[PDB]
């Protein structure tokens, strides 16, 4: 699975 963190 691809991940994205929008800190
Ligand atoms: Zn993954």
At which residue do the structure tokens 């800190």 appear? 7
How far is the centre of ligand 1, averaged over its atoms, from the C-alpha of 2 (Å)? 5
Cα of 7 from ligand 1 centre, angstroms: 19
Q: Compute the distance from residue 4 Cα to the ligand 1 centre, in Å.
A: 11
The end-to-end CA distance of the chain, in Å, is 19
* C-alpha to C-alpha distance for 7 and 1, rounded to whole angstroms: 19
Distance from residue 5's CA to the centre of ligand 1 (Å): 13
The token pair that represents 3 in the structure block: 């991940």
- Residue 3 backbone class (left: φ over 0; alpha: ψ -120 to 50; beta: rest): beta
Radius of gyration of the chain (CA): 7
Ligand 1 centroid distance, CA of 3 (Å): 7
Give residue 7's Cα distance to chain centre.
Answer: 9
Q: What was the resolution (in A) of this experimentally determined structure?
A: 1.5
Give the chain's largest Cα–Cα span: 19
């Amino acid at each position: 699975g691809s991940n994205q963190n929008n800190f």
